[PDB]
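dumping this here so i dont lose it again. seq + smiles for calcium ion
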Amino acid sequence: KPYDYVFFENSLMKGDYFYSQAKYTSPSWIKNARHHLPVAGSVAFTPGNSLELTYVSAPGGDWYSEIQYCPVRGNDFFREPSTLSMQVRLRESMNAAALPNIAIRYADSTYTQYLNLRNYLKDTRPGVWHPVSIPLEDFGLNAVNDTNIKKLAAVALRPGTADGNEYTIYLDDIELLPASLPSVSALNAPVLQEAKAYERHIDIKWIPEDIKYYRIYRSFDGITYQPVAVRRPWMNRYTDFLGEVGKKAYYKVTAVDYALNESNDSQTVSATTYPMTDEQLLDMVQEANFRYYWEGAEPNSGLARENIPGRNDMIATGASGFGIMAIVAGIERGFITREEGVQRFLKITSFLEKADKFHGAVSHFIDGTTGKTVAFFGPKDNGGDLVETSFLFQGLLTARQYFNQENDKEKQIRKSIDNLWKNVEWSWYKQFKDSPYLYWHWSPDQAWVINHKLIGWNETMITYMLAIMGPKYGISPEMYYSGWASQEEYAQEYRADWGRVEDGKMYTNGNTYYGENLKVGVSNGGPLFFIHYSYLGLDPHKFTDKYTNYFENNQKMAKINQRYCIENQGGYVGYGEDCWGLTASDFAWNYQAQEPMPHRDNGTMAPTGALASFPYTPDASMKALRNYYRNHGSFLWGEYGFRDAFNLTVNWVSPLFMGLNQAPVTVMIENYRTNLLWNLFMSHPDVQKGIQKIQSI
Ligand SMILES: [Ca+2]
């Protein structure tokens, strides 16, 4: 599906808008918070909010503003646009010439020509939203399409007439649209299924034609409704964070087409928030994250999307393994029935049967509609990803132990998984017969070009575990020491290269951080997801190598991370006992692999850090959960659990939910609660054998 290339719809944060700039040279002025545009929460075309553009264009002064396109992982396919559409509202009547000049800033920081905004404003009456359409043509833009649209970095704004007066205009729904607006033959209300209240929020969900968005209406009395949110068609769900307990709200949803016609109302649903215990909070968090892998699954495969909003069709195989485990948990927790689960797993297993194999391994990314590998990370990564394969198969072997009933469907699930599992040629990923290491990747056409050795401490322990547990194409248990825990010079250098410290370059570490002596681990543990991914199924309580027991050591990493965060050397806003777990996520412009280390901390906290650490640091993780939900939920709690990351220091929250990050929360919560996934995985015969073999060295 194509996205609209949107510069602004709504700020997920209050106050100011991360993806904007506003600056000035006195005697001119533009209102800004840390050179970001203010977010007006009291006026909006698409509810939530709009951007406030309050300025003084004074003779001899200047101001500049821009609204920056927010890149989102996998947001690569867009409608071919012809127009820059905005909604513009003037607070006061004004000379139209005092309105801003407008341009588009390219990715290289050159600009289009500036146009007077007055020329696209039929009506300059204040206190009403005016649709504006600027043909891209008028900026002197040639044909815009997927190959070049991302060079349209920002909508730039400059003074009109320097008349020296203060004007406030509001800008909303700044986006590129096609010349021909998508239309719909009929514009029907979605079926609004229910409202589900929790403590601070109500979740509504509906079932759906190329509409623009759903508009959500809320009433506190059932009589008068106000528009509270919009949801794009890729989200059939809305999370209304009331922030208030015992609060009744009624909800009504309409569908809006690109012409901004509105369907009739859905049925009205209501719910009332109520106080929640920690148990209820765990349930809710597990459930919301589960949604990502259930209703949020790529529908053909049943598997986990890399991210939402992201590629519609691309599944991530590692995240899918995590999600598989989230789904098993979700069945046990009664979020879905076993039969629903079974149906999903029949689809999952049939799809994985058909997916491209690379010596039995899977690629990182697969197109869920075709089974074909997607070279999402570049043309070299177009074949097997053994680590992702291991994450997938950690999930599948867990599922295989779960679906143990003697019926034809669970038999088929089991059959399929056993065969998929047996046929992962782990040994192939040695590259050489005598390689001390597994390799991360193998390309069908470029062979070992990426050439990344699997060297711990990092996230890849389960890759070695599963490689060694593989019943047909297993590798020697010695590979755990020669590869994963390699003492070679090269492996030492590899560790120090990413770690930027010498600590843990010997696999073993032995240094103390925040009073915790870390037996194993690069630096003070690396991104905290290192103690999650390989330990969703592999029970770290039940694996001990010659250096350490892993629950003990992993738990130290969690505590170290929390203690770093409490200490908060960086002075980052909101870090503390209830806000910790530095780990990898997308941030504003790029991926970052954050750690409890100054050079890998910039104020960005991914909730998955603390939350998937539950089994290790339950109280600390429960504190995080409570904080994230009750204090930060207005921006941080969403339809698929917590947003991927947030940075209170720069006033940013992630626009996405990440396949990698949501399931660990469900799964590790579950392992803390019942040991479910651990017990499942650890009961697998091949798993037991491999562990025995490794521990007997
Ligand atoms: Ca808006």
